[PDB]
Amino acid sequence: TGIFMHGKIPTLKISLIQIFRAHLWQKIHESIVMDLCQVFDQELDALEIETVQKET
Amino acid sequence: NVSQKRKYRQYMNRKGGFNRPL
Amino acid sequence: VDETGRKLTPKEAFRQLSHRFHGKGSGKMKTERRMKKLDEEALLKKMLGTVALLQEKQK
Amino acid sequence: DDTNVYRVTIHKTFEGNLTTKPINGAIFIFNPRTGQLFLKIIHTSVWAGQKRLGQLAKWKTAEEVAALIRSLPVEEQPKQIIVTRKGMLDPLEVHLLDFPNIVIKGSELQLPFQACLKVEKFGDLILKATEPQMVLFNLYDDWLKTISSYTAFSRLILILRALHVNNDRAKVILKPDKTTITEPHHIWPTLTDEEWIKVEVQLKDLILADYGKKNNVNVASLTQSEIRDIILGMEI
């Protein structure tokens, strides 16, 4: 994940890894990028969008 | 006003390429 | 938008997200349970006391 | 109706102690939207045990209330359990926790369940509800006779509300043709469409006479919109 912690705190560490279990950071990043792509594609007329893609 | 289905990348358990497919 | 086009709940949306992410969905039993739940919801939306009243009409 | 399940017939004696023995376990449940009614008939002793407080009876009624929903299908189970008994609603809501899909909403409008006690046919059914097994309570034939199912309850409630205010006057107010139209498929008789409303007008006038005599507003001053709410018990 992308949470920076200063000093090992076992309670906070375990709570964070419970909250962010199963690649939750990658999942939310993919969700936001897909939502942005869909929004851009929907309004592609006024934006003169020829291609709206994502890199590998 | 309609929304076509939304596709997604299968990064997990994908041995085809190191980088996620686009 | 799902296959039927109905507005999915956020839990279902995240389920679809994760199924696409891992490259595989739920198991056979889970799919049977899901389709049974969908059929039950469809039947409920389309709507037994008439039969009971007709039976009670006879002494 | 929570009081119906806990209702106990009381004897009368000049010197002997009154025998407030339980009558039956039926809660006089009704469901106008479902086109029928529920008769959770239980034994009188089972309904109210020896030295059983009202709270104890309410706790036992909550278990039976959830049992009726448990037996019924989830779709057939009431989506909203509108019970005017706010005090008994919370144990029912606590009982409703066993069914998260179903919901419980407070009922500002109060159904006049005293009509069943007032009506001899349902009053005999109250004695006939002494069997511990659940019974089937068919909907009123007046509701079936009425074209509009939405107004079918209103026609039934208008007669029922007048019966609660005055049972003897309600029978006189109710048309004998509508009264003597009982069918084997219904506990209560049918209604002659518009003719019943004319008979129900006298039943409405009976409430209006009560409103005219008791309340400062005259009988005619009692608005039909307020009377309909009073018939459904919308006021607290």
Place this chain on the structure above:
Amino acid sequence: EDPSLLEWDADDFRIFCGDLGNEVNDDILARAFSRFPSFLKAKVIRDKRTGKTKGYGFVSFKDPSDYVRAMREMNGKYVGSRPIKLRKSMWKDRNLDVVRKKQKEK
């Protein structure tokens, strides 16, 4: 779609073994688990290419008494790393599925 399962249908007392390590489960492990003299079955579901078992296997015995004995004999104790779990095999064939679908009316 499983002709081998039909050949394995001879032994009625079939048990489902679960929580199997990919390398832990093996034919030798099944043989060590074959306490009863009746013929066993070491078949376990595995990947088509890599052969990595999913952790589910089925052991078939012709002796229901041996089935009952092994139900509590080898519950939680297994030679390899991953401890073994035993479940009553609810396996069904397509004919049973069709019969259940037909009888689901009542």
Place this chain on the structure above:
RNA sequence: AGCUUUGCGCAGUGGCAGUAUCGUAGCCAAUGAGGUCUAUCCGAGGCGCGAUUUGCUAAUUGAAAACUUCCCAAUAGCCGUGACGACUAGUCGGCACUGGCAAUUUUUGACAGUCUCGAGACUG
């Protein structure tokens, strides 16, 4: 022959089944278990220990609630125009399309609804 008393096991219903109950390979018995009753005494075990069958199925959480193939690249007529041959500048038969094919006689729909005893009537 009918009927009745009673118990066991089995069959059915009902009932209780965390002051509810068995198990004991332990331990003290109707010659007597064990009393604070009744100690010329009642008469049943006393009180430890070990604990509260099997099968059906739903529902919830989770990405996944475990029953013996994925994915990839693709797939399994007409009007005119230019040559060719035939019949008297015209016509016919076959070849490909360098343009078109939603404006009354054919292909981009004058169609739909309701009612009566295969037939008819009304409306938009």
Place this chain on the structure above:
RNA sequence: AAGGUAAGUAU
């Protein structure tokens, strides 16, 4: 100085 090694899985 430190009191801040995730484990797991075969290479």
